[PDB]
Design a protein around this motif. Structure first.
Motif, PDB file in Angstrom:
ATOM      1  N   UNK A 251       7.473   1.833  -3.693  1.00 15.49           N
ATOM      2  CA  UNK A 251       7.820   2.302  -2.355  1.00 15.49           C
ATOM      3  C   UNK A 251       7.729   3.814  -2.228  1.00 15.49           C
ATOM      4  N   UNK A 254       2.046   7.689  -3.299  1.00 20.05           N
ATOM      5  CA  UNK A 254       0.831   7.127  -3.878  1.00 20.05           C
ATOM      6  C   UNK A 254       0.716   7.456  -5.357  1.00 20.05           C
ATOM      7  N   UNK A 290       3.269  -3.143  -0.650  1.00 22.16           N
ATOM      8  CA  UNK A 290       3.390  -1.695  -0.735  1.00 22.16           C
ATOM      9  C   UNK A 290       2.289  -1.085  -1.569  1.00 22.16           C
ATOM     10  N   UNK A 291       1.680  -1.868  -2.449  1.00 20.95           N
ATOM     11  CA  UNK A 291       0.499  -1.378  -3.134  1.00 20.95           C
ATOM     12  C   UNK A 291      -0.702  -1.409  -2.194  1.00 20.95           C
ATOM     13  N   UNK A 293      -0.482  -0.859   0.870  1.00 24.28           N
ATOM     14  CA  UNK A 293      -0.239   0.259   1.765  1.00 24.28           C
ATOM     15  C   UNK A 293      -0.685   1.581   1.168  1.00 24.28           C
ATOM     16  N   UNK A 294      -1.205   1.573  -0.054  1.00 21.57           N
ATOM     17  CA  UNK A 294      -1.648   2.777  -0.723  1.00 21.57           C
ATOM     18  C   UNK A 294      -3.081   3.145  -0.394  1.00 21.57           C
ATOM     19  N   UNK A 328       2.412  -8.918   5.633  1.00 22.23           N
ATOM     20  CA  UNK A 328       2.484  -7.461   5.517  1.00 22.23           C
ATOM     21  C   UNK A 328       1.454  -6.932   4.531  1.00 22.23           C
ATOM     22  N   UNK A 335      -5.250  -2.069   7.155  1.00 26.73           N
ATOM     23  CA  UNK A 335      -5.058  -0.735   7.724  1.00 26.73           C
ATOM     24  C   UNK A 335      -5.694   0.342   6.859  1.00 26.73           C
ATOM     25  N   UNK A 336      -5.620   0.196   5.547  1.00 24.54           N
ATOM     26  CA  UNK A 336      -6.056   1.286   4.708  1.00 24.54           C
ATOM     27  C   UNK A 336      -7.367   1.009   4.025  1.00 24.54           C
TER      28      UNK A 336
END
Lengths: 426, 10, 9
Positions: A251, A254, A290-291, A293-294, A328, A335-336
């Motif tokens: 969390x 990066x 959350x990974x 999200x990196x 998620x 998104x990334x």
């Protein structure tokens, strides 16, 4: 002998001015407080015994009454906050800290345990235990060349109490206390006892449950590889706090996330994302989210490790809260991710289980999912391939679902549906 | 997390 | 230092 006394008899003996009568009554109190079915904690408290027990902690001349009162006070402090408070209110904290120096292992151990119960009540008593100076004598109990020479039960109690000094979040423990404790926690994280390892992992999971600077203090200690190794343990009681710790670390930044990737964590996620314990799957999938999200190079590691099919699997079948973390994970990914990363996601079969979850009642996962579909369409536009995704979405009943959510109590669902429909279904 | 407090039955 | 990260729900 001291079995099954009445509280009245205990009081009688403790109020005698006969140290041996006091000792027998204190042991009788301890056996009463030691029963699993409704120990009469409040009756003991109501009788005014806590101050007497606390004063008995100071009787260096009579180590058995120190032990008996330490054990009795431990079990009172094991109760409700109000019961723990009564122990603290009796002055037990400095008296227990003094007992940490006892030459009798079973007495300093009981004092370790009692301080753990007090600190375990919450951040206020935790910080009060710290302010009274408990950390230095606790750590001194572990200042031996090899932890394996300490009694196992003794080491487990110390580890557990240390983990309660690391526990709770508003506030988090004092930074200097964490820095003081961390080198000993690192060492306990390499000890060969599964319970010490579990509790060390719990302690690290608490320390990493906070802002990036808290995570950094742990990550800078070099423990992430060891955590990743513990992540592969066969003992669920070790894997669970080890995974919470790893999840907490990702969390952060990066760069902190990269250290769990560098340490090999992703190679364990095929097992974690199929783990029979649903809480492990939920945690692992939250961590995955959350990974993803990196950075794109971190999304790429997820890809390289073969983890997108596991995310498709969790999206396809898991308990709903895990499926929501998978949703998620997908939206963060889309998104990334690069266009080719998003294409690969479709090639892995993300669309159908994604559409199936649009029938969920949870309106937040619907927003998550429609956002993911939006991002996938946005990558399909960059390739001129929006139609065959529209067909794909239509062929599995997803268009029916996006048409459904066209009418939906929530405005954000509402809008994203018709916009997807007017732009990609005409 | 495991338990905040621990009772000693011993 | 990455707004896309999420804490536990």
């Amino acid at each position: 002998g001291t079995v099954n006394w009445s509280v009245e008899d205990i009081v009688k003996g403790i109020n005698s001015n006969n140290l041996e009568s006091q000792l027998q009554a204190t042991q009788a109190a301890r056996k009463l407080l030691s029963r699993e079915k409704q120990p009469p904690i409040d009756n003991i408290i109501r009788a005014g015994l806590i101050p007497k027990f606390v004063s008995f902690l100071g009787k260096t001349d009579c180590s058995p009454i120190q032990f008996e009162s330490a054990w009795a006070l431990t079990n009172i402090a094991s109760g409700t906050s109000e019961q723990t408070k009564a122990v603290v209110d009796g002055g037990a904290i400095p008296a227990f800290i003094s007992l940490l120096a006892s030459p009798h292992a079973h007495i300093s151990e009981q004092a370790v345990w009692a301080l753990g119960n007090i600190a375990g009540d919450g951040s206020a008593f935790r910080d009060l235990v710290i302010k009274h100076g408990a950390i230095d004598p606790l750590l001194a109990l572990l200042a031996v060349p090899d932890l394996s020479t300490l009694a196992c039960g003794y080491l487990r109690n110390l580890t557990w109490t240390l983990s309660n000094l690391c526990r709770n979040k508003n506030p988090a423990p004092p930074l200097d206390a964490v820095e003081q404790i961390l080198p000993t926690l690192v060492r306990l994280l390499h000890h060969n006892d599964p319970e010490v390892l579990a509790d060390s992992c719990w302690a690290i999971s608490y320390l990493t449950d906070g802002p990036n600077e808290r995570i950094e203090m742990v990550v800078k200690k070099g423990v992430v590889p060891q955590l990743v190794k513990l992540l592969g343990a066969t003992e669920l009681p070790i894997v669970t706090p080890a995974l919470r710790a790893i999840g907490n670390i990702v969390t952060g930044t990066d760069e902190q996330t990269q250290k769990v990737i560098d340490a090999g964590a992703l190679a364990v996620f095929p097992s974690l994302l199929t783990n029979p314990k649903t809480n492990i799957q939920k945690e692992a999938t939250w961590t995955m989210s959350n990974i993803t999200a990196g950075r794109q190079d971190q999304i790429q590691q997820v890809v390289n490790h073969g983890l997108v099919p596991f995310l498709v699997g969790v999206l396809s079948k898991a308990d709903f809260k895990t499926q929501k973390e998978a949703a998620w994970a997908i939206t963060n990914y889309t998104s990334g991710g690069t266009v080719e990363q998003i294409v690969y996601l479709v090639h892995c079969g993300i669309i159908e289980p994604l559409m199936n979850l649009l029938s969920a009642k949870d309106t937040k996962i619907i927003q998550v999912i429609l956002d993911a579909i939006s991002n996938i369409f946005q990558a399909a536009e960059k390739l001129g391939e929006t139609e065959k995704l529209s067909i794909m979405i239509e062929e599995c009943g997803g268009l029916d679902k996006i048409e459904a959510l066209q009418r939906h109590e929530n405005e954000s669902v509402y809008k994203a549906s018709l916009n997807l429909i007017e732009k990609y279904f005409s | 997390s495991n338990p905040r407090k621990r009772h000693r039955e011993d």
